[PDB]
């Protein structure tokens, strides 16, 4: 049935796969992306505090399970920088660095699996409850700001490995500040051989990237830069024996064999639930952003809810099979597309390359220095840092879009990354109220010899109709802007009906221009409860000083809510609702005439 | 100057005060409200965990300082139920109940003063920075929900005092649940004499309230119920000697003398900053709500910012002079108005009544049982509990207004009161995005023999113009709803321009109805950055399949932001902006004719 084929997209898109003009392309793309996943896999695993094999496990399992339940065709899932950074924060916070090393690593990976599990379950939940419309509310400025901030943290973290210092640091409030001054203090304790292999690594990386970009193809597959750099570095550090002689830190023992099946111990559920919620939201945001971009560019559509179910299932299975939360990335996805990726066959191919390295190659990466991994992370951070090109653009167009970007960026750098995201999302939602809370109110006049009405301050041509005052608000009337609307009505019509009633009563017990106000509700998108209360007030007041109030332009939903809210018994009838300002005006003049006689 | 008179309203409204038809009324109102403040002062002081004299200090100082800097004329400030409940939470959390008693009380009141100070400073800050428009965003359902929840907590807290049990409880997550089952467990440990004086207290209160309400005036001032009940109870508990014989808990020693000048020790600033922020926001919300209600009803206006400055100064001075955060209340304000309050002279009068009780009367309230105070609190909780009459009303009109009320109510009862308020405010802001995220899109037709255009599905009369497709969205085009807008455009116009371009290119390299789309932007309130990007996409796509796109109805601000965002160089010129759908249609038909030849 259509439900089972929509809950397993693989069973629908796989039979249709034409093996002649696609298979070659997807195999090229898969080999290119596998060659890129291995080094980064290990690197991002260090950045999350886990042992190095978890990167390989996270590069193997997730892409498979996604290929099965996933709707996007150009996304590459795996271990990505910012999710790695969040997992790292949690692990070293629940497990300080102080037999002992293996005990610490066992508790570390238990925390990692609990994180993966809870994040998977949250993503899966949101997907089943059809709440995948809430990923719309994660603004593009919000995620730009967020990922740029996180790239500042990731850059600072990998400075220490890059010199060879042994600085402890935090990800807590203002931690960046004392972390960089910690690095400025301990720069005389710089290992020189570590700095050497770091700069050698960067030189080899920039040579290979520039060379294979500008120079002639002579290759169906581009040159895997990170892989050959990792290979050359481990060979050098094994021959010249850097580890024991010069004291250069290396990657530990990488074990041979498939992942062991594990169980995330939920004893830690109340400690890590906060960071698991942050991991789930960041995963959704970046995975679905990428999917949507490539889908638009290649002329197809992804389902947000099925993407949440896919990503959720991916992380839960990974949780059992010794992984840490995977997510879509723009860098791998760009590489998977530019290589000639057409389907999730490319993901399956990449995962087979990581698989053969998990089984066979394995402990050849013993003598790999940690400085080469830190350099790889930095050259891949280019992407996220070039998003500072967005703060001027936003500035030029919309200052509230600029502020969302700035608040999230500063939130992330100069407080926690979880707190940064929370503050950013709040401010993001507030900016809608801030746009609608002082709307654009106008008094309309008729253009001479035409049956259209427009603003009198903006179109001096338009004349007010005698006896008839027409006022138009250009916004919803809800709790934020209802007091303002009533005030601006009483200011631009130049009548306060309660002051006028007070004057008239006072004069009569001691012994206005218009007879009809027409509210143009064409632009009133919606009303809430406070809006309806305010409208009842306005109509009752102007009834008391003897002024009929007509509504000209209400949409169906506003009339229905005014009807529910009891607008239609305090003097106003549904015979006072007109279709256009003109019809209201005509009826008003006609009533005035037939009531004169 | 006008600044000094606006920063001290007393210096402007006091000289004008006419001593003949007001002074008598304000003195009656002041005596009525002083008589009501004394008992409740003490009661609410117990509910906040402080010693009983702090209620009297908080009933004396704040009303004075408010009379000086305050803009409202019917508000009565003092110690109110919900602020008392928040202060209490903080105190017993930072100071558990375990010489010893006086040491604990000293640290308790130090915490209380720090709370008052920080809350005052936050209110003052918001007022100076002209951020008093943010008190608009605190919806009426949000505050109804919140105060009703808090009244459930306050009611449960005063059950234990009312029976005479010695149950410990919390205000933490789900604390209500195990707190009520704690009371159900310990009901066999009920003191009988305590329950006696509790029920005697309630009987005297309901007798005096009903009697002085229905029966003949024979009185310029109504009968102060709470005061005479406190007096009768202390006399009974002193003669019959309840305290030592039957073990009835009593109010401690109430000291004679003016408050001592104190200093809030800011060693506790990082412990109590959260709860001080909650106290400041709840104070603003309830004070300004009351001020606005009575101002509307009596035909004047209050300044939100000057109210924040007034309330801030009030709490800072109180902080120094041995008080805890005061706020406006609807109950006292109603009583101050119904008694014949005209100005803040009534507040000054009330504070003089509390003053003479601080100096002279004082330790006569030694033998006052705590059960009488708990009964007074419960009969004053009527107000807040009768707000359950709001959940049906909201339900009937607007389900999102109903959900704001429910989420805040449940947040407050079944989690923390601070967390309840935070969750409520979030959801409150989200409901604006939820209303605007799937707006009402339409395809418009011309009414026959009329130059107006309306929906074709809703008005079958209207016919589409040949060659011209008119589409109208009835919302802002921002990040929440921009993908939807593009989708609904491509669905209701029945053309996907990228699919059409693909078909045409494919056909040409192997070997639509309309020529003009008119976007009616009359109801587009605003655009953000993502909106402009989407609009550029739409225009570029329909340029590629050879369809001119005109904008008919953009307001000034949208055109300016489209101009900034670079909308006006990808094929569209400012010569494609029309004033009305009709003008666009005419121009489109004319261009088509003159281009045919
Ligand atoms: C009661 C509960 C309260 C509890 C507390 C909670 C309080 C919550 C907080 C709420 C406070 C937020 C209020 C914002 C009001 C909106 C006004 C607004 O922004 O419109 C813009 C002004 O803004 C700008 O353009 C400013 C940009 C510069 C700011 C920092 C630069 C630093 C550079 C780098 C230095 C780095 C570090 C420095 C930073 C420190 C002008 O807008 P516009 O041009 O007219 O166009 C758009 C139209 N609108 C939007 C205005 C309609
Ligand atoms: C664990 C529980 C967490 C619950 C959180 C609840 C959810 C959060 C809700 C968030 C709602 C909105 C809060 C964000 C306010 C933005 C401020 C702003 O406009 O400043 C802008 C940049 O300034 C910045 O750089 C801001 C940096 C971050 C913002 C801090 C806000 C306070 C919360 C931090 C909490 C600290 C906690 C301490 C440690 C725990 C510039 O100001 P501006 O005035 O717009 O400038 C233009 C001038 N005019 C003309 C417009 C006026
Ligand atoms: C990606 C990031 C995510 C991270 C996670 C964060 C997730 C954040 C969460 C977000 C989730 C919120 C989504 C809400 C969707 C809006 C739909 C909506 O409410 O419209 C209404 C349906 O709603 C109702 O009427 C329901 C009312 C009853 C509910 C409980 C009753 C209990 C009674 C007592 C029992 C007590 C206990 C029981 C309670 C347990 C229908 O609306 P309508 O009639 O058409 O009129 C208005 C029109 N609109 C508004 C619809 C346009
Ligand atoms: C200290 C740091 C704090 C930072 C917080 C950050 C800021 C918070 C941001 C708040 C943003 C929005 C969150 C509120 C979600 C409302 C849920 C909803 O719609 O349910 C409603 C009632 O259900 C209820 O009774 C809800 C009760 C409270 C809501 C809990 C939300 C999770 C946060 C709690 C945190 C727990 C923390 C644990 C302890 C610390 C009904 O659901 P519905 O689906 O609408 O029903 C109608 C059905 N359809 C048709 C509409 C579908
Ligand atoms: C996409 C890739 C190929 C870009 C080129 C990568 C190499 C050759 C170059 C360009 C990108 C560069 C990194 C980008 C980011 C930064 C941050 C900056 O504050 C210090 C230099 C540093 C750390 C750069 C070092 C050199 C670098 C790694
Ligand atoms: C310092 C951290 C917070 C990064 C934030 C950078 C912000 C504050 C800076 C970076 C570059 C800046 C822009 C650079 C260039 C111009 C062009 C000029 O004609 C108007 C100002 C404008 C548009 C600047 C506005 C502020 C800006 C966006
Ligand atoms: C405004 C005043 C005068 C109302 C009348 C007060 C007295 C006479 C009456 C009516 C209001 C009543 C209280 C209102 C609230 C509740 C909550 C309910 O679950 C149990 C009874 C209890 C605790 C009531 C006890 C009796 C009570 C105190
Ligand atoms: C139990 C706690 C959470 C209090 C919340 C009460 C809510 C869920 C209840 C209280 C009273 C109820 C209302 C009582 C009466 C009616 C009239 C009927 O024709 C339609 C339903 C309607 C409108 C009910 C809807 C739900 C309602 C508002
Ligand atoms: Cl990446
Ligand atoms: Cl009260």
Residue numbers in the entry:
A (entry chain A), B (entry chain A): 58 to 155, 166 to 578, 637 to 722
Give sentences from the paper.
Prestin (SLC26A5) is abundantly expressed in the lateral membrane of OHCs, where it is responsible for electromotility. The structure of PresTS protein forms a domain-swapped homodimer, with each protomer consisting of 14 transmembrane (TM) α-helices and the C-terminal cytosolic Sulfate Transporter and Anti-Sigma factor antagonist (STAS) domain crossing each other.
The interdomain interface contains mostly hydrophobic residues. In fact, we observed a density at this site, probably corresponding to the Cl− ion stabilized in this position by R399 and S396. It is likely that F137 contributes to confining the Cl− ion at the site. Notably, the coordination distance between the Cl− ion, and R399 found in our cryo-EM PresTS structure is 4.49 Å, which is longer than the typical coordination distances of Cl− ions found in Cl−-bound protein structures deposited in the PDB server. The result revealed that the contribution from the helix dipole moments is larger than that by R399 (details in the legend), explaining the large coordination distance of the Cl− ion in the cryo-EM structure and in the simulations. The Q97, N447, and E293 residues participate in hydrogen-bonding interactions between the gate and core domains (Cl−-bound PresTS), while this interdomain interaction collapses upon the transition toward the Cl−-occluded state as captured in the recent prestin structures. A pivotal hydrophobic interface formed by V499 and I500 (mutated to leucine in PresTS) is located at the C-terminus of the long TM14 helix and involved in the domain-swapped dimerization interface of prestin.
